Amino acid sequence: MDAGDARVERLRRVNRYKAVQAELAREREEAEFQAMRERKISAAARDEA
Amino acid sequence: REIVCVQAGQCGNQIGSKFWEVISDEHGVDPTGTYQGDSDLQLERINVYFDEATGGRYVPRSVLIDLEPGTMDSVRAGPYGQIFRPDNFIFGQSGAGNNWAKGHYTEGAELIDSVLDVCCKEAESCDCLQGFQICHSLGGGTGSGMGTLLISKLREQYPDRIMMTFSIIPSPKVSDTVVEPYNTTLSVHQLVENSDESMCIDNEALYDICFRTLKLTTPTFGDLNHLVSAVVSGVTCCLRFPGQLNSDLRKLAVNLVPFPRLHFFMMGFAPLTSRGSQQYRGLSVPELTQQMFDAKNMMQAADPRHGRYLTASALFRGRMSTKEVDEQMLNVQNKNSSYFIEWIPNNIKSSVCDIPPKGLKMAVTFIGNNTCIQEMFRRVGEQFTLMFRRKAFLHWYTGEGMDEMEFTEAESNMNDLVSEYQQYQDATIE
Amino acid sequence: REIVCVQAGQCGNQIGSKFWEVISDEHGVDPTGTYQGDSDLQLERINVYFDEATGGRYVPRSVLIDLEPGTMDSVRAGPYGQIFRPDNFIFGQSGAGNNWAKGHYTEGAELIDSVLDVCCKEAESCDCLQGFQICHSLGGGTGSGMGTLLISKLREQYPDRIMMTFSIIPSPKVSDTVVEPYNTTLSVHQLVENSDESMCIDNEALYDICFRTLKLTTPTFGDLNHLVSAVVSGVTCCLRFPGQLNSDLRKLAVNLVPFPRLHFFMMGFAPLTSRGSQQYRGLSVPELTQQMFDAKNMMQAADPRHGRYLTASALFRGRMSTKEVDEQMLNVQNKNSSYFIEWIPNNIKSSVCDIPPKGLKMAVTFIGNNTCIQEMFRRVGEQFTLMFRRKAFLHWYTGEGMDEMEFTEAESNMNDLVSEYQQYQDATIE
Amino acid sequence: REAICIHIGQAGCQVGNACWELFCLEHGIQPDGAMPSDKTIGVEDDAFNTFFSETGAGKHVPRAVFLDLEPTVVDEVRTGTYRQLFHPEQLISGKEDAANNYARGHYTIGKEIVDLCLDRIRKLADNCTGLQGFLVYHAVGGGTGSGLGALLLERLSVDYGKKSKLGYTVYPSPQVSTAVVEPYNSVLSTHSLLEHTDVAAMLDNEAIYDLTRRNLDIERPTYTNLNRLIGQVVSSLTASLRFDGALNVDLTEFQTNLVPYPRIHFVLTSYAPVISAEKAYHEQLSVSEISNAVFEPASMMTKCDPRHGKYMACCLMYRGDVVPKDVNAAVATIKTKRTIQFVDWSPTGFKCGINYQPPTVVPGGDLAKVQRAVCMIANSTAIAEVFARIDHKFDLMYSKRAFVHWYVGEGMEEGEFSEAREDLAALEKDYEEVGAESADMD
Amino acid sequence: PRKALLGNWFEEEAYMRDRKRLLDSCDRGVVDAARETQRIIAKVKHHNSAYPMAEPHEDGYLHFYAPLMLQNAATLGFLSLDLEDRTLRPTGWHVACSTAPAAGPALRNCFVLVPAPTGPTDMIPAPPDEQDIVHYGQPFFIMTVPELCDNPLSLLSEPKGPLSASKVTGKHQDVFFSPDGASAEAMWVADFANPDHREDMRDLPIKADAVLVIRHNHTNTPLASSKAVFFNDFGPENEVCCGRFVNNPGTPCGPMKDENYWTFVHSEN
Amino acid sequence: FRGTKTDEELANAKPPSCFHENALPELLFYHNEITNPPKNLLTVNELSYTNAKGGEEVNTLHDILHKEGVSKKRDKTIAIRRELGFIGYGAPHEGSLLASKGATATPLDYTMRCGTTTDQNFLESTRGGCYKPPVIPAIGRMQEKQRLLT
Numbered sequence A: 001m002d003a004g005d006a007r008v009e010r011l012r013r014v015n016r017y018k019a020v021q022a023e024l025a026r027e028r029e030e031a032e033f034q035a036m037r038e039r040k041i042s043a044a045a046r047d048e049a
Numbered sequence B, C: 001r002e003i004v005c006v007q008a009g010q011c012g013n014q015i016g017s018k019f020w021e022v023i024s025d026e027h028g029v030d031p032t033g034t035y036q037g038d039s040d041l042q043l044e045r046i047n048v049y050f051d052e053a054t055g056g057r058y059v060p061r062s063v064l065i066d067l068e069p070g071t072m073d074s075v076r077a078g079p080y081g082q083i084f085r086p087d088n089f090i091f092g093q094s095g096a097g098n099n100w101a102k103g104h105y106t107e108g109a110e111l112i113d114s115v116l117d118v119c120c121k122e123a124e125s126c127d128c129l130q131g132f133q134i135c136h137s138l139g140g141g142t143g144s145g146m147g148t149l150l151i152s153k154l155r156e157q158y159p160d161r162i163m164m165t166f167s168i169i170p171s172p173k174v175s176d177t178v179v180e181p182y183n184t185t186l187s188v189h190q191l192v193e194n195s196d197e198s199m200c201i202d203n204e205a206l207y208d209i210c211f212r213t214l215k216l217t218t219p220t221f222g223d224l225n226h227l228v229s230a231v232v233s234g235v236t237c238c239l240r241f242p243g244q245l246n247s248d249l250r251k252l253a254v255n256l257v258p259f260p261r262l263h264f265f266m267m268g269f270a271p272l273t274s275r276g277s278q279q280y281r282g283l284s285v286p287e288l289t290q291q292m293f294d295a296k297n298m299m300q301a302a303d304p305r306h307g308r309y310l311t312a313s314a315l316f317r318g319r320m321s322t323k324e325v326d327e328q329m330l331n332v333q334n335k336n337s338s339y340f341i342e343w344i345p346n347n348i349k350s351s352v353c354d355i356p357p358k359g360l361k362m363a364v365t366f367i368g369n370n371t372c373i374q375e376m377f378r379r380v381g382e383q384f385t386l387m388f389r390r391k392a393f394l395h396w397y398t399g400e401g402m403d404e405m406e407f408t409e410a411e412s413n414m415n416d417l418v419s420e421y422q423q424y425q426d427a428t429i430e
Numbered sequence D: 001r002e003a004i005c006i007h008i009g010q011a012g013c014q015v016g017n018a019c020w021e022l023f024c025l026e027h028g029i030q031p032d033g034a035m036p037s038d039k040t041i042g043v044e045d046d047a048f049n050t051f052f053s054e055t056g057a058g059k060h061v062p063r064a065v066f067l068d069l070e071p072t073v074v075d076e077v078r079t080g081t082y083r084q085l086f087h088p089e090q091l092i093s094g095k096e097d098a099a100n101n102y103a104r105g106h107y108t109i110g111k112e113i114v115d116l117c118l119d120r121i122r123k124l125a126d127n128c129t130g131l132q133g134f135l136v137y138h139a140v141g142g143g144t145g146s147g148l149g150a151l152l153l154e155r156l157s158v159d160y161g162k163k164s165k166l167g168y169t170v171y172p173s174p175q176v177s178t179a180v181v182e183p184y185n186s187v188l189s190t191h192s193l194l195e196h197t198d199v200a201a202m203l204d205n206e207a208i209y210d211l212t213r214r215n216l217d218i219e220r221p222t223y224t225n226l227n228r229l230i231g232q233v234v235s236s237l238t239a240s241l242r243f244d245g246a247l248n249v250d251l252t253e254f255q256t257n258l259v260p261y262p263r264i265h266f267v268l269t270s271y272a273p274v275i276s277a278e279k280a281y282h283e284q285l286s287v288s289e290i291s292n293a294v295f296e297p298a299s300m301m302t303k304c305d306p307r308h309g310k311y312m313a314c315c316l317m318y319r320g321d322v323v324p325k326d327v328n329a330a331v332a333t334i335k336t337k338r339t340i341q342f343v344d345w346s347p348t349g350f351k352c353g354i355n356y357q358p359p360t361v362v363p364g365g366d367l368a369k370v371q372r373a374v375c376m377i378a379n380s381t382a383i384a385e386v387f388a389r390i391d392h393k394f395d396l397m398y399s400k401r402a403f404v405h406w407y408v409g410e411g412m413e414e415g416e417f418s419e420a421r422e423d424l425a426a427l428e429k430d431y432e433e434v435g436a437e438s439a440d441m442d
Numbered sequence E: 001p002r003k004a005l006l007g008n009w010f011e012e013e014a015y016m017r018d019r020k021r022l023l024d025s026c027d028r029g030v031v032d033a034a035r036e037t038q039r040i041i042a043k044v045k046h047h048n049s050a051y052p053m054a055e056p057h058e059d060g061y062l063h064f065y066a067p068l069m070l071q072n073a074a075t076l077g078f079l080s081l082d083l084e085d086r087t088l089r090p091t092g093w094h095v096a097c098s099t100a101p102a103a104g105p106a107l108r109n110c111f112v113l114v115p116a117p118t119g120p121t122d123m124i125p126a127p128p129d130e131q132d133i134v135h136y137g138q139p140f141f142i143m144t145v146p147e148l149c150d151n152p153l154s155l156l157s158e159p160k161g162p163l164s165a166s167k168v169t170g171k172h173q174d175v176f177f178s179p180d181g182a183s184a185e186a187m188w189v190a191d192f193a194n195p196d197h198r199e200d201m202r203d204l205p206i207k208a209d210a211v212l213v214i215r216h217n218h219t220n221t222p223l224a225s226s227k228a229v230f231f232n233d234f235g236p237e238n239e240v241c242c243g244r245f246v247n248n249p250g251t252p253c254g255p256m257k258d259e260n261y262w263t264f265v266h267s268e269n
Numbered sequence F: 001f002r003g004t005k006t007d008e009e010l011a012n013a014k015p016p017s018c019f020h021e022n023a024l025p026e027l028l029f030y031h032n033e034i035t036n037p038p039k040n041l042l043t044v045n046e047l048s049y050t051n052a053k054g055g056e057e058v059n060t061l062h063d064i065l066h067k068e069g070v071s072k073k074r075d076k077t078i079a080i081r082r083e084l085g086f087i088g089y090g091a092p093h094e095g096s097l098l099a100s101k102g103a104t105a106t107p108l109d110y111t112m113r114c115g116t117t118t119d120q121n122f123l124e125s126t127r128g129g130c131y132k133p134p135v136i137p138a139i140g141r142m143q144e145k146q147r148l149l150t
């Protein structure tokens, strides 16, 4: 009885953990893309000036 | 009018988890099991699928059986898993090995008595019992052998009720298991004697639904099991909600089955359309009927254009006019008159229910009895005869204990079923 | 209407300690003896088992007897031990040696007078005395021999009261003692003439209760003694609380003992269910009655299906309708009519009590006089004849002083009672 | 649930070192048997149980025996780094070798040692509650591996009966060779193995050398490289028991799908993403590419060409990030190909398995890190070519009794050579008859 | 990003944006992983708020109605509760409790003492001027601060049986918090540290810093904290149970080890 | 065969398991606004036969076929919601308004002393956030009071 409950609890925690990590990875990728675009625009303006 | 569910094997338990999620959502049952709905219309027929435990809570009248507990541990670990009664999970200690004879004769008889005890407790607890409903695959091991064993026992104990099955059958293009023809042949032999009505689904047809209609880039088995859970929960909708023209499993059976062997049906569910396109087209009865007869939306590999309809049934959910339903069914029968068997004057039954599935204005599920189902059985019989002439892999089955005469009986019974469909396809008034 | 308790030997003292824990809990008595309850209904029948000592205190009407003080010193040193009256602990200086003859004839007569003095002081202190209650095992040494000695003295001195025993009997699968058949046969011979009603429990049946019904992974004697304390405190519950249909030990005996020599009964208690499942199913009279007659829930190795019920009794606790009780007992008698003795038109007595055990909505305790108890005695007689034919351990008993004629008398007397059950089992209306 | 591994002789123990290295690193058991706690998830997991059992103090010990007649290699295991992991009784060693004589292992020397091995295996099987087969690792080229492996398989087959026995066997390579008497020992081993094994997996060192030169960039490979590849293959096949997946595959499913007749149990094995770390980041590795890879003969771990025969059954194990729809599309494309042929009595040729755990990377290893892999074991009539060439070499030596006096002196009747040669002739005819197509009517 | 527009890019862009809108807008209850992770973070932030504990009294005695902490002699941790590890039982709501290290007073580890109205039928009553002082042998309640939740909780226990066991080891009685109170199952009695002078110090006032043993009045079983460790949302915490811990299992009645001893912690002067 | 040294290397030896996210059912079937689907729980018979003389409005056929809402009758749902509010699952918290005659849950000394000294500002400060503490009723005392009655 204890073994089955332990298995079920581990499965639910690990599934929640995987979902959260996937969402954070996607958000970080988007943020890096936006930062790259912004810094390149700033560099172009500075060079022209 | 209470239904008892049986879930067998991995596929059955997986489809069942999504089905019981959909049903619990429609009746406003929280995943903790507490009733939280907001209209009496939800509560007043909850008994059909749920039994009432004390202080609010409801528990679902279903038996889960499998030979290795891995799937059951996954469903208990799922988001709605807590709702299921702990005592309803029955398991052994070793797998079916994809062998029909093991599942039917050796590991079967040890558990079957405990399964019958649970099924009898559930049936005898009902104040009035409606038919049983079973979902399983025919290609597997425990699904085919133990499902047909249990079906035979329940048909012995309750011969006056209805027996309904939803069944998964091997795709025509790719096999998942080498010994599929034996398990399929023996299971179809058992079903045609024992069952009253059987619905068949091909996984290849669900993949074609997902890719062509919904345009999903990377579909998964969760999507296929949602489509199946949607149609299965739709066929029973008139039992449990009010409507302008009520219907019942026995009334579907009386209108669909002309002769007792002709009980194999095609399935479809109409409102399918991709998220980008859906903003561009409103729901209406002509659109649902047009999608309903397109072979793209039918969940089996045989296509209606190579056969003829003996009978069909359509169940509509939502607030709609009866005139549009009646005139659509008349127009389809008149314009395509060559595809309907002529010695029956009207082939379509309609039924109308007031309450649609959540988030749809209207929906229909379609059940069709069409002779083109004979092509799948013919293919299975050819592959079986190819395998059997060389007695391929036969020692497994004979070592478990089967007589070779069962294989020749099952082959003969399927050949007679194919012949009977072909003769009624080509019948004439004269 | 007050009961006097006697606890004898290791098993008796251990079961008694848990019983007095359960009773002190039910009436809200602190282990210091202070009343801490919250309704007059708890207080108003406390006299039945407790005497009142000065300024508040209550003392439990029990005598503890054993031949070596190890168990008695452990219970006196235990957490509830202080509640017991110091003068009530009686012990010797040498053991029973696991021998019935030693326990009955040599060390017995030395203590028996001091035990009778304490028992008489307790009996003569009552304003009106109800029956005696005795707990002991039959397989042991001092329990069987000195318990039956004391029973004989109390039956000579108080022949008009009731004598009730709870007794542990050897398991069919594993022995705890080699010389069990002699001690069992001689003790059953003594009880057959002396006792008014005797209840028998197998430890193997408690293990099967724990493993199958409650699904405990690693049960201990605390669980077995809790099951026993629950049933023992349940049989007397109607004596000490109000109800719609009162009952009494004498009324139970008059309605269960058809002929005089037949006074051995099996016991069961119904609302056993595992802690995980209990949230899933509410209590009702059909569920309790169905589990109550299921042999799965019965505390002896003999199964009712091999015999017939000559009489039975059910004690219900809770606020419930009499109609449901009466119609359930009629329905069970009608559906299983072959298992009920024909000469008696109604074999079951019912009784209803308002106050359930804490944390349960409803409960029933079941007492049954079945003829399948004859199978246990026949098996014990076979093992006895196997040992006696070879004089297997007889020199111990003859050295204590027994004439060999006692063994042949005890064998003959028991063989008669088994035949009497065989004759009443197969009797006809004629 | 549980499986017990039996390692015999020199090759089997050395391959065992790589296998248990891998199983430790994949589950996370430290080399001294401990396992570090996790703080992100609240409780630990049962996955070790297939290969490890825990003591009441939480130390892990593995479900294996190591059997050898010479002490030196087992003493090397005893004195190495994993000293504290193994139970000392599990490492069983005799005094002196079987000297490349099958007769010395089977008749003279193994008869004394075999009862200790059976007592250890019995003691293991008593500490189980769902044992589902034996895995056996040995080489048939040497004396003790052949002779004691056969004797032990016979005894196991009598005592345990129906329980399954799956063998990984190192056969004599078709032109690389190490000892003169290899054909006699391999023939005599194969005679016993025919009756007493359920599936036999075939390996050739020349193929793994070819695979490590062509795909990896290693000029001078050694046995540790081959053993790491073998360990990866065994881990891929047993992963279906141990980790979550879409389509699991129990060890009994192999026997049901791969073996049509009880003698036709010898299977070919191959593995797809053998690739170096520098090559791996220049290329995608989609499902269809690795599925196309497993059918090329350059991918195989046995030196045979399957284009000269017909397939009877294939079992495909996918592990990692794979979706069933891509597996179905790949298998349908393979089925379309004209250079892949199945016997006409086996129309439904494929079994699939899909597991989510990608393959583990070993600190000293030479394989790249990859998100997905596929492994195939398949039964094909092409295997008949391996036996015919061993049998021809046996015939060449036996025509002159080239070495027979050793075998006769160590306890064997001359008749046993002729019996075994007739049994292998019957096995050759079985592969001739089973592979004949009756597709033409009349 | 956008990637190259070959194949099914249009429908998948639409699907991704609709999924993003659904996840950002809807609540979805406990199905959403991000929302429940955020609410667990807010849970942990709320439970660990500081509390203004009371200073020690001038007389140096143990007093009622004053915030306090409970520390164990073996674990050196403070008694704490988790409001969300709750299950419904036939006897009511059970809330799990443990002992954990902490940086100071908090809403999860500050309690008050409330006296019980009935003594053990041989009590010598205290004088009227010592009403607020806690004496040995006098029952009292342990309760949570009013700022934690609407309904006050109490420390309870139940007899051991087939359906009752400790949280982790399962070999002792169970201790849990419950809104049940003013009952026979919520009374506790303190005793002296030295075993030989235990009955000489009965019905006497308790010093502010005494090491003492807390007993369950209705079962006569001392309170304890073992070394068993379980994880929860706060980290690793120990187990709390009622039982007697002894050096020799063969003599269950005897000397008690350090994990049956407790203490009361005040604020620093 | 040199063994591993640190726990970090042993941890990074395993790659994390891949995870496939099943598509949400709202992404497959929903046709209205995905963030606010309309609620359709009306029957034609209830919406047709009204009590026009009493005061409730009448509906045209287009109104019958195209109206969103929930049926007015909710007696059993109200009873169930009240029962679960007493039990403890009810969001509206129907209980805690009054206590039974013999089902006390807190000693009166706690209410008189150390119960009237609550700081409202501190409570408001600690409650501020996306987490609110639950309210747990004293069901045990209630059912104990019900148990000891005839």
Ligand SMILES: Nc1nc2c(ncn2[C@@H]2O[C@H](COP(=O)(O)OP(=O)(O)OP(=O)(O)O)[C@@H](O)[C@H]2O)c(=O)[nH]1
Pocket: D008, D009, D010, D011, D012, D014, D015, D069, D070, D097, D098, D099, D100, D101, D139, D141, D142, D143, D144, D145, D146, D170, D172, D178, D205, D223, D226, D227
């Ligand atoms: N792949 C691989 N092959 C090996 C390994 N060790 C030995 N072999 C091969 O197996 C054959 C030799 O068999 P051995 O294991 O040495 O024979 P044995 O079991 O020790 O028998 P005895 O010599 O009588 O003790 C040769 O073909 C070797 O190339 C190994 O670690 N890996």
Ligand SMILES: Nc1nc2c(ncn2[C@@H]2O[C@H](COP(=O)(O)OP(=O)(O)O)[C@@H](O)[C@H]2O)c(=O)[nH]1
Pocket: B008, B009, B010, B011, B012, B014, B015, B096, B137, B139, B140, B141, B142, B143, B144, B168, B176, B203, B221, B224, B225
């Ligand atoms: N549609 C659908 N098919 C499934 C699912 N799970 C397994 N299958 C199919 O069912 C067959 C495998 O049978 P299985 O359930 O494992 O048989 P069992 O071992 O006896 O339980 C294969 O064709 C799978 O593709 C599922 O969730 N949905």
Ligand SMILES: Nc1nc2c(ncn2[C@@H]2O[C@H](COP(=O)(O)OP(=O)(O)O)[C@@H](O)[C@H]2O)c(=O)[nH]1
Pocket: C008, C009, C010, C011, C012, C014, C015, C096, C098, C137, C139, C140, C141, C142, C143, C144, C168, C176, C203, C221, C224, C225
């Ligand atoms: N159920 C139960 N059985 C017991 C207990 N103690 C002993 N027994 C059983 O009683 C028998 C031993 O009798 P015993 O009491 O030792 O006889 P004595 O030596 O005369 O006191 C054996 O069958 C034991 O298993 C107990 O606490 N509970």
Ligand SMILES: [Mg+2]
Pocket: D009, D010, D070, D097, D142, D144
């Ligand atoms: Mg060697």
